[PDB]
Amino acid sequence: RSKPKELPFFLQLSGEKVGDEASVREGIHRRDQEAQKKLDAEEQMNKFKVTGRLGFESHFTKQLREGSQSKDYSSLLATLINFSPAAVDLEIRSLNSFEPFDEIVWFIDALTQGLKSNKNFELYETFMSLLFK
């Protein structure tokens, strides 16, 4: 709801638009728009070309992995509470979902430990609802 709002030289007309009722009586661009959308996304990607060297592992997943190694996610709960909501939704949607399901199992472990910790209960349950979303 908050996204903003906004010829060939050889014409190709059809037998009804021109006077060709014989071809009418015996009558026998969405893909262009898809390719156009591919072109606009390509324009966005070649537009942004910042070559600043950034880290491989992000801070959130690094802290989550460290919490799973330590078998305690207290620091992860801390940074989760301190996150910005857009960052929360971007990270939760960009979890990794493979066949071992390591990240999802660790996230559920963290939320169980948090609900046992009994602080910001509204936030922990809305985090789990966002995960199920």
Added chain:
Amino acid sequence: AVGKNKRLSKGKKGQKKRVVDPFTRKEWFDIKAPSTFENRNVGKTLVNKSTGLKSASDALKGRVVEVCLADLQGSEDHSFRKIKLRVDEVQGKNLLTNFHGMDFTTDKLRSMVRKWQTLIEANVTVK
């Protein structure tokens, strides 16, 4: 019309089966122009059959072909002119032809006739 709502008439009661094989039973013959012209060899015509050598001879004796002098002489400036020849003797897939008549083309005649001059026509007979 070959439509299903074309009302049938007396018409197509008894047909024939298309088994004549016409352009296999027909035969190609090359014609040739008199020596007065430059490029004599022009085209090939179609004889109905070869069982009748009389048929080939009579059809080719009756043939009246027509060409244009531009293509006959290589100079395309004789575009408007046109001659008619008629074939009169045959010899072995090769025909000898002679002169029969002449004409212009109607586009040239209409482009000649203008609106602020007088036209004069002479109409003679000779031998």
Added chain:
Amino acid sequence: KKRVIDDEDDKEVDTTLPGWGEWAGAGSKFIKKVKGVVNKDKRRDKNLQNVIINEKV
């Protein structure tokens, strides 16, 4: 200065029409002058360093 000089100078157009002579086509292949308001050498801002006099005005 270059703008107004090319403005006021006498033009020379090429009225060569492709066509009439020979094959003017994609495969392979009549000049008149119109006097301007002044010639480039008849101007009265030559030899003046920083002056632009418009003879059209």
Added chain:
Amino acid sequence: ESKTVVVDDQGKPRFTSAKFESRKIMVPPHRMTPLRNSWTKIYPPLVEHLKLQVRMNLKTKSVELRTNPKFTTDPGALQKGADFIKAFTLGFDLDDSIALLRLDDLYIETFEVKDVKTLTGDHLSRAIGRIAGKDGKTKFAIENATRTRIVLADSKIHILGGFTHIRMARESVVSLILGSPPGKVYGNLRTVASRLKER
């Protein structure tokens, strides 16, 4: 290419891999002056979008369109250009003949007043007067109604447009020749234009 044979299984062999055209068209002098006048807006679509070598023999008063064996692409380009120059020769406007080049189903039809009804002189003058109308009003009415282009020569008349469009224009013109007043034929024009706009 070199030539060697490879004997496959089952003894099979194995090998490896290894016209210009011209038209001419005349031009009458009364349409040769506008040809010289607006020639520079004629040859660019012929040479750029059609790939058609153009000459003009002013010694024979003709225009020649020759297509090149390698530079051109489409076969029908030559016939399209010939129809283009033919429409301009018959006397249509330049943009309208460009439209004939631009589309593929525009046709040109021609017929005469003595091919409708034999008229003798002064009546023929009044018949062309009734077709033309005061300052081309009836003529441009037929134009705007049926989406066509009408050219009145001395006697011959020319209609450019789609097939059914020039058919309806021919009907209206023939009724005008037989003597229907411009009020009645204008009412019929706005009726046929109403139903044509609705469809």
Added chain:
Amino acid sequence: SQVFGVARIYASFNDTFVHVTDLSGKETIARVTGGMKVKADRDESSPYAAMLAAQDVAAKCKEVGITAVHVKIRATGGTRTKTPGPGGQAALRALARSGLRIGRIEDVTPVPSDSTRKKGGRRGRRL
């Protein structure tokens, strides 16, 4: 090199014949009709009719092997109209697109010198 046939294109007012013959007009290679290509009675005088006609005629003509054709268009002639119609122009375009080598275009319409009466009457023929 090439071989030439004569494509006589009779663009009638309510029909269209595309008759291809050899030189001299004796042997007829192929012949069609507008209605016979398209099964209606309005559409027997259509550009679509002429296009289908010329496509199948060019098929038969290339079958026999004639690469190039001189073309002789024709209107109905007589005391009727004397100019070839949209059907004829459509047939010509369709032949050129079908790819027979077009050699030379003529318009042999029988223009009466001094015609008889026409079918209309004193008030006018049509409408």
Added chain:
Amino acid sequence: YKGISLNPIYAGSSAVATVSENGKILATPVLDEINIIDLTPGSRKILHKISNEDEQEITALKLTPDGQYLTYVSQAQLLKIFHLKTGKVVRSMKISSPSYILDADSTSTLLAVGGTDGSIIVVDIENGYITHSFKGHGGTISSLKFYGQLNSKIWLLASGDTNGMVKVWDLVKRKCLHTLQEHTSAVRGLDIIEVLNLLSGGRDDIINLWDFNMKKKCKLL
């Protein structure tokens, strides 16, 4: 009411029907389709109708002496080679000349097409790529013929013209070996027999027989 529709088999287009070495198979053009029918004593049936397009008629078609491939040329200047096992067109390529004569080798490895312009092209059947294209004579092709042994190194390709001419070519060298002008009209049929002797049926009246060699030894037998 119950209704059993009986359909025509060899109708419409003037192209020859073809069979393999066994009578078990047949391929036939109806006006746009190629019906394949099995003939077996008693249990003659149909296999599958191929339905490329109703517009263009089949110009020619050929089925190899083993029932494995079907090669057909339609009205547009292209050849479609079609697998018979899977029942699927394997390849299709334009030839830019309306082909009318298709001759396959006894072995299923080579098939040659020939049209009206005079140029012929011979294609490999299993892999649809043309080995070589002969410019040929300037006349319209009326017949072709192959000579190939099962395990050999010499292959001959003979073309019978609308002119009274037969051009025999080497295939492993691709040279105009012998140009025999003997007939007066088209060569409707051709043949090559083992020693070499060559037969040519010229449609006017003639059945020519030429003694023949790889070298310049070729006279009228």
Added chain:
Amino acid sequence: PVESIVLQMKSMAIHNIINFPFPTPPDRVALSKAIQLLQYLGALDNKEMITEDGKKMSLFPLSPRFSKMLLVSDEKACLPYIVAIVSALSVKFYKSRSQFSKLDKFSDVFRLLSVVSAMDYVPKEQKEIFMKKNFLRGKLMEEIVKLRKQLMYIIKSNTSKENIAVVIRNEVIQIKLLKQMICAGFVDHVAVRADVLFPDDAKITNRTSIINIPYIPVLATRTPNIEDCFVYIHPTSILNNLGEMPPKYMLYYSLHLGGNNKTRMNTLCDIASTPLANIARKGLLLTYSKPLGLKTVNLSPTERYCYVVPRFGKIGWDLNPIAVHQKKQKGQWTVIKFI
């Protein structure tokens, strides 16, 4: 040739290759190394099934690295040079060696390319005076030419290439594509030079022969023992303690331990970030990161464009951020094409 034999088993439907018995079985750790190396090379996926690449390698009767060379070089169209390379590797002297090392192209694969090209350039016994000027071996050189014509015939018969005129003949050059295909052959033997003992800090102080101390960590995650190890250049290679060198990574042939307990790489190719990215992408080691201010358009739940920094990695090193058009299927964001 255990990589090729397990390739043969996979292409002929042996799916329990550890459990597959022999009369005399080879080393199981060795065969598992072969599995992981071909999985990295791209003949096999992470779930051990064959690929189209592996089918082509099984039709090829030769080594997997060399057949990878031939496949990618048949794609990028440098067939005579690559067949010279594989034939040579299978079967003033300093002024001449510099002239045929051909600055700037530092890799001795390109040097011996210049050798074989100048050899086919020169006619007879000037051939002999040329090879005595260049201290070569004429017998090895004719071995190169006969083997390269032979492998030309081999890949013609395997029909990976287009052949007209059936008999097979041998015949700027796009150096980026050349080093790219050499990378495709030479993975996983990667190494990356390190500051500051390698650059121009070490221009002191010897005359007429300067030493620029090679300080280069070697990496390969399929070989985690030698992963991230300091290496020094081999002296017979033409990069013997050279300096002022523009690129950063080198793909080598093989490591070997020699005198003063010093390890050395055999032969080198000078490579950078996006060729490593393309080749490891076709392979396996490019484990990607989450995308990332830069926009990440998502067309469909399956398809998106995004800016990802990939990891070449007991640890590996990472690379530039690349824009990538990747698809989500089978529960992972696999990569189709680069930007």
